[PDB]
Design a protein around this nucleic acid. Structure first.
Ligand SMILES: [Zn+2]
Lengths: 44, 300, 97, 43, 32, 35, 97, 50
RNA sequence: UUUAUACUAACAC
RNA sequence: GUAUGUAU
């Protein structure tokens, strides 16, 4: 139809195991990593 | 069509300087209405922009008069000099040649014995004059010079015709100046002429008839300079001179000044004399009478 | 609208842009943006009053007086009605115009 | 120190520092940025 | 006494509007 | 509706006195220089 | 105001009124305009003369009266663009030229 | 021509303060006009010339 | 026959 | 007198 509507990036990029998979977020305790990060920023 | 017929069409145009192939090109753009100024469009038309030469006509009646009827006649009807049977000039006049004469200038006045030669016919550029008419101007030049030679003086004369589209008469004016101040003038003008106008011109500032006269003294000016377009010219002695052709006349001076400013400096006068205004009118005896009696001794 | 008159005066400072349109528009938008702030610099000078402070002006005036005093300076008069130089002066003025 | 004695003014620019440059402003026309942008591109 | 036009700061410090236990972060330039 | 601050008035009249005073200082100087 | 007073020295009181008055003006551009009380305007034909003599003031707060009279020298016969009378006066100050 | 101008009348007691600013500013006639209220600086200059 | 307006204008200087 | 449309 046009130039822009040609095949491009036929591949998606699912999340690899280290960079932020959804399963690793469940086992992660977001709660405590949040507080500890605020204390460090505040102290400095 | 036809070649022998087509030759006739070409010579007719040659006399009519106002209309050629530039006016048919410039007319076609105004007439076109839809005209985008590109290279894509100018090619897509191409033939449509050149096409004309149907409405052009008139033949002899157009050329005989020249420079329009309404314009030149309006100039001729008002022209304050032009010597005929019918018309008598506004200038008082001193001595009449067959095709020229001496007369006194406007009231502001540059010097005590300031005069001007004027041809009888409507000449404009003094290069358009006949060689028969020019010979009378030469006898005037020598007698006027010899008049001021007894006074211990000498003279510089000049003429200024930056615009012949206006279609004015040309008055070659005589300016009495002392010989030590005369010898400086070659410098003054040479500065003024090179400075005055913008210096990207083609024609090159300064064209010496003083060196040309050594090659051909009878006519250096007439040979070298060209009549058709603008111009300005000064001279020393009979056939010396400096010469400059004028372009961008708006820059030069519409009322005459570039030369008059140089004489306003060289001779040194107040800043109220610099600009020439007034009129000839008539019957101005007390000033022009003193010149006639003095001039008649040296005047043929 | 202000943002842009920033961003395009720094694609002209540099060189990138062309065609009057943009160098015409973002000359307008400045000319306003600047008149806006030559208005405030006036209004907020009559409201905030002279910044010089008399004591400072007194020194500046008096010190100036001593300088002119030291020179034996003559003050420039009003043009006489019989003044040889005025005709010359006028012509110059016009020639400049 | 007789040259500094002759000066008719004294420590004028004495407390010239600090300014509100740290203070962010929600007014594009009356920031410091803009005062520099008009400082530079004019006169 | 005289506040020269250059100084004439129209608005109030970002602190004194909260100015105590709140963190005032001015972030123009990027990092990384 | 806008008005000038009081300091403006102060400034104007402060200069008048300097011009008055200085004028006399010049006439004092001029008289001294005649001797 | 200060200009009006400073000006009043250099010339007649009537001329100096013109200049000072001349500067007030209304400035105009399209939809908008404003008065010009505070600033000095350059468009005037004589705005050179105003800025040179009022610049003179801003030199006589840096130099000081003492040094300035040495540089310019006597008013009767002032020194060259960058010369003095004596070597003593030349070396008296850190400010040479 | 406009309505905002006050052509008619000049009220003595309001007017002795209009010549007062001339002592302050000296010339400066366009900054005087919005204060004095009568505007039309021409007349504000001509009134002090009376 | 005179005066004005527009159209002739795909005119001319 | 076309660019652009209306009628046969
Ligand atoms: Zn003629």
């Amino acid at each position: 139809t046009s130039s822009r509507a040609l095949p491009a990036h036929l591949k998606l990029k699912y999340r690899q195991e280290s960079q932020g998979t959804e399963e690793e977020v469940r086992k992660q305790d977001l709660r405590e990593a949040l507080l500890r990060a605020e204390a460090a920023h505040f102290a400095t | 069509p036809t070649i022998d017929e087509m030759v006739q069409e070409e010579k007719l145009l040659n006399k009519q300087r106002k209309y050629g192939q530039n006016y048919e090109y410039a007319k076609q753009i105004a007439k076109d209405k839809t005209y985008s100024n590109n290279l894509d469009y100018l090619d897509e038309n191409a033939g449509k922009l050149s096409n004309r030469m149907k409405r052009g006509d008139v033949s002899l009646a157009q050329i005989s008069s020249g420079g329009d009827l309404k314009k030149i006649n309006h100039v001729l009807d008002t022209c304050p000099l032009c010597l005929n049977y019918e018309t008598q000039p506004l200038a008082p006049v001193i001595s009449l040649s067959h095709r020229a004469y001496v007369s006194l200038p406007t009231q502001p006045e540059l010097a005590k014995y300031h005069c001007l030669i004027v041809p009888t016919g409507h000449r404009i550029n003094t290069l358009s004059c006949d060689e028969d008419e020019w010979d009378e101007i030469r006898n005037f030049m020598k007698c006027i010079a010899l008049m001021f030679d007894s006074m211990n003086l000498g003279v510089i004369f000049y003429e200024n015709a930056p615009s012949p589209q206006r279609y004015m008469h040309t008055a070659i004016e005589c300016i009495p100046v002392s010989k030590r101040i005369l010898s400086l003038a070659p410098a003054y003008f040479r500065e003024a002429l090179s400075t005055s106008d913008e210096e990207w011109s083609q024609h090159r500032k300064i064209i010496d008839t003083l060196e040309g006269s050594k090659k051909y003294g009878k006519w250096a000016f007439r040979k070298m300079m060209v009549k058709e377009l603008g111009y300005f010219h000064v001279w020393f002695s009979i056939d010396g001179g400096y010469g400059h052709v004028v372009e961008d006349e708006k820059a030069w001076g519409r009322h005459d000044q570039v030369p008059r400013q140089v004489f306003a400096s060289m001779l040194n006068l107040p800043p109220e004399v610099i600009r020439r205004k007034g009129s000839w009118t008539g019957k101005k005896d007390p000033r022009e009478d003193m010149f006639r009696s003095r001039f008649e001794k040296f005047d043929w | 609208w202000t943002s842009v008159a920033h961003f395009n005066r720094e694609r002209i400072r540099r060189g990138a842009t062309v065609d009057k349109t943009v160098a015409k528009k973002n000359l307008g938008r400045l000319t306003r943006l600047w008149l806006k702030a030559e208005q405030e610099r006036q209004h907020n000078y009559l409201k905030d009053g002279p910044y010089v402070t008399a004591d400072e002006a007194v020194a500046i005036y008096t010190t100036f007086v001593h300088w002119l005093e030291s020179r034996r300076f003559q003050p420039i008069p009003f043009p006489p009605l019989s003044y040889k130089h005025d005709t010359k002066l006028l012509v110059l003025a016009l020639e400049r115009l | 120190r007789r040259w500094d004695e002759d000066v008719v003014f004294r420590n004028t620019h004495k407390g010239v520092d600090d300014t509100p440059r740290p203070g962010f402003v929600n007014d594009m026309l009356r920031s410091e940025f803009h005062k520099k942008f008009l400082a530079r591109f004019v006169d | 006494a005289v506040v020269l036009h250059e100084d004439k700061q129209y608005y109030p410090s970002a602190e004194e509007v909260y100015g105590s236990n709140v963190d005032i972060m001015v972030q123009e330039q990027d990092t990384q | 509706d806008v008005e000038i601050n009081d300091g403006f008035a102060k400034f104007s009249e402060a200069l008048y006195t300097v011009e008055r005073q200085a004028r006399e200082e010049v006439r004092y100087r001029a008289i001294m220089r005649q001797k | 105001t200060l200009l009006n007073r400073l000006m009043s020295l250099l010339m007649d009181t009537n001329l100096a009124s013109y200049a000072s008055a001349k500067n007030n003006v209304v400035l105009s551009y399209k939809d908008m305009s404003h008065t010009n009380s505070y600033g000095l305007v350059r468009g005037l034909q004589f705005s050179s003369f105003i800025w040179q003599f009022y610049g003179l003031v801003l030199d006589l707060l840096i130099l000081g009266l003492q040094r300035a009279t040495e540089i310019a020298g006597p008013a009767d016969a002032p020194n060259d663009f960058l010369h003095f009378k004596d070597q003593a006066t030349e070396t008296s100050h850190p400010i040479r030229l | 021509i406009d309505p905002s101008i006050k052509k008619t009348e000049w009220s003595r007691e309001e007017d002795e303060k209009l010549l007062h600013l001339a002592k302050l500013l000296p010339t400066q006639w366009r900054t005087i006009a919005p204060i004095v209220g009568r505007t039309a600086t021409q007349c504000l200059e001509r009134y002090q010339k009376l």
